[PDB]
Ligand binder design. Sequence first.
Ligand SMILES: [Cl-]
Ligand SMILES: [Cl-]
Length: 124
Amino acid sequence: PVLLKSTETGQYLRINPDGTVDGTRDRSDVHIQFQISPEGNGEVLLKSTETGQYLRINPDGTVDGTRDRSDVHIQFQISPEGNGEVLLKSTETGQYLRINPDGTVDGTRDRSDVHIQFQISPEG
Ligand SMILES: [Cl-]
Ligand SMILES: [Cl-]
C-alpha cells in the first residue's frame, strides 16, 4: 500500500468506514493506507486498503468514499508537479483533491492552491 500526504500540512488522507473522508497526522491509523489501481490505460482509482472504498470527488466539491464501481467520479489522473510532489485531479470534474488545515478534505479547480500538493510514499 501507499500513503497520500499533504505536503503543506503533513496530514495523511483517510477514508473512514462510514464513508467520510478527512486528514489525520496519526501515522498508526490503518485507514490511511491506499492501493492505486489502473482504470483503463490513462487513469487510476484510489482505493482504501482496509475498507475497499474508492475516493470520490462530487460535482459540488465534496469528497467521500463509495463502493459503487460504476460511479463516474472515482477516476483520477496523477500529475507530477515537482519535486516528488503530485496533484490528484478528478477526470470528470477537473477538481484537485485538497486537504485543508482543519482536517477537512474537498475539491478545488484552483491549480495554484498550496493545499493540493501531495507526496506518494510506500507504507512499508
Ligand atoms: Cl467511521
Ligand atoms: Cl481549514
